[PDB]
Each structure stands twice: as structure tokens, then as C-alpha cells.
């Protein structure tokens, strides 16, 4: 599964809403990754996924792996919407 998205938090994707979303691509069975301008990491990593430095109006493009891929592509959708992450 593969989705990409635009960040819409002023603040990019950086501590306590970035610790949500990886706490949310945890639950899954799936590997999952986040992917911003060329640089892939674990989104199960949250070292990784603040290593990034992901900000405002960055792309940004999530790919997940396994069985449960499709419940965890919508469960990271919704958490990136909940926290106002991206869209």
C-alpha cells in the first residue's frame, strides 16, 4: 500500500503528534515506512521518523507491507488528520 499526503501543521511532523503516529503504524502487523525528499525510515521508529525534520507544506509519502496493510494505511490517515498533520 502506498498513499502520499501534504503537511498541513505549522510546525511540520515533530514531537508529541509525530509520537502519536508512530504509536498509531505500531498497532499493525504491516512494515511501514515515511518517506520525505528521498530519505525512508521506519514510521514504527520514532528516532527516524524525527530525524527527518519534516516541515510545513512538505510531501511526504507512506508505504505499508503485509497482510493488515489497507487497515493500517486508513488507521495512519486518520491519525494524520486527527493530530493536524496532513491531508
Do not use: C
Not at 505500531?26 to 525510515?41: A, D, F, H, P, R
Not at 527516524?48 to 511526504?60: C, E, Q, R
Amino acid at each position: 500500500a502506498e498513499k502520499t499526503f501534504k503537511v498541513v501543521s505549522d510546525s511540520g511532523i515533530h514531537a508529541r503528534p509525530a509520537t502519536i503516529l508512530v504509536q498509531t503504524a505500531s498497532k499493525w502487523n504491516s512494515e511501514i515506512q515515511l518517506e520525505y525528499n528521498g530519505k525512508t525510515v521506519n514510521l514504527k521508529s520514532i528516532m527516524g521518523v524525527m530525524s527527518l525534520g519534516i516541515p510545513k507544506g512538505a510531501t511526504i509519502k507512506i508505504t505499508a507491507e503485509g497482510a493488515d496493510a489497507a487497515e493500517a494505511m486508513a488507521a495512519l490517515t486518520d491519525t494524520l488528520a486527527k493530530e493536524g498533520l496532513a491531508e
